[PDB]
Amino acid sequence: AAQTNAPWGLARISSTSPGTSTYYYDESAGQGSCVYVIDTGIEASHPEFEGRAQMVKTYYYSSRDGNGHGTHCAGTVGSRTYGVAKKTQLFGVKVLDDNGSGQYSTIIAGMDFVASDKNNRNCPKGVVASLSLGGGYSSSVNSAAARLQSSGVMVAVAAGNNNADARNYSPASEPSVCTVGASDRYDRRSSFSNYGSVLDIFGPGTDILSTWIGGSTRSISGTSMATPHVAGLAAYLMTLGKTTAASACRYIADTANKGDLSNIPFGTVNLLAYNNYQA
Ligand SMILES: c1c[nH]c(-c2ccc3c(c2)OCCO3)c1
């Protein structure tokens, strides 16, 4: 399948070169997989989700996304125009309030919720969790992310936007999950992206167009935007039978575009997420 005039990040994940604008992908499109977006919620009624999005849990007075951040991330995972995996099922878990903030105890509860809740969903091709959130180092937060991964969910987490080593942030610093840095349309490390030995992969993170609340769209930047590219890619590859939840991060790194990013510090991987789709 070919999507013309796609957002640059989708085109990038199916290309050996920057600077193109068509996204190429197998039409299976993540059908039969599920992706949990653990964030501020998802505006499920947005036409871009085609009925494939639903809220499954909130810790606040509403499950609605009153912020936009979670809707934008969910759109990068699986919306019809802005998503990597255009036929996946999207499940929203609102651990962040409408200002984008949340207590670690709530975030931990949300991760343990997903580890159990997947047993209440139909995801024959596998389950992914996208965590575009974090804060300072916490062993408890890292342990919750490791449990979610161990339970059979491909966990992708944002590296953080501090232009610093991700070892001091959580869940970014958890070794067993997939920690995602951000790049720009010229294959430069995004100026804000964290780095370090704990990163597993880079994805498009600067000027990413996706869904927004009020049935709208907008372009924003962050490692929060790169993470759902990798989460959607995992769901797409799992549907194709090329990998499993336990191995998807390693598979994405093994099959990535290698050595093509600039301004990557010594000791950080130079790997850019790539679907290896041959049209
Ligand atoms: C080769 C030439 N310059 C660099 C470099 C150095 C320090 C860095 C960096 C990149 O990216 C950000 C963290 O600090 C490698």
Token output for 165: 């080593």
For residues 111 and 121, give the distance between their C-alpha atoms in angstroms, rounded to a whole number.
Answer: 15
**From the CB of 265, is ligand 1 less than 6 Å away?**
yes
Locate the DSSP E strands across 159-267: 169-170, 178-183, 201-204, 208-212, 216-220, 257-258
**From the CB of 62, is ligand 1 less than 6 Å away?**
no
Q: Any idea where the domains of the chain sit in the sequence?
A: 2-272
- Return the closest-CA partner of residue 182 out of 154, 153, 207, 149: 207
Question: How, if at all, do strands 208-212 and 216-220 pair?
Answer: antiparallel
Token output for 150: 């161990």
Residue minimizing CA distance to atom 9 of ligand 1: 265
Give the residue, out of 163, 261, 262, 263, with the most ligand 1 atoms within 8 A of its beta carbon, to mutate for a pocket test: 263
Residue minimizing CA distance to atom 8 of ligand 1: 265
CATH tag, 2-272 = 3.40.50.200
**From the CB of 262, is ligand 1 less than 6 Å away?**
no
- Structure-determination technique: X-ray
For residues 200 and 177, give the distance between their C-alpha atoms in angstroms, rounded to a whole number.
Answer: 9
Residue minimizing CA distance to atom 7 of ligand 1: 265
Contact present, 33 and 78 (Cβ < 8 Å): no
Contact present, 208 and 180 (Cβ < 8 Å): no
* Distance between first and last Cα of the chain: 7
For residues 270 and 91, give the distance between their C-alpha atoms in angstroms, rounded to a whole number.
Answer: 31
Length, in residues, of the chain: 279
Token output for 4: 């013309």
Residue 267's SS3 state is coil
**Sheet containing 153-158, strands listed edge to edge, beginning at the edge strand earlier in sequence:** 53-58, 89-94, 33-39, 126-131, 153-158, 178-183, 201-204, 271-272, 257-258
For residues 274 and 187, give the distance between their C-alpha atoms in angstroms, rounded to a whole number.
Answer: 13
Q: Helix (H) and strand (E) counts for the chain?
A: 6, 15
- Return the closest-CA partner of residue 227 out of 148, 140, 161, 142: 161
39 is catalytic: yes
For residues 130 and 161, give the distance between their C-alpha atoms in angstroms, rounded to a whole number.
Answer: 16
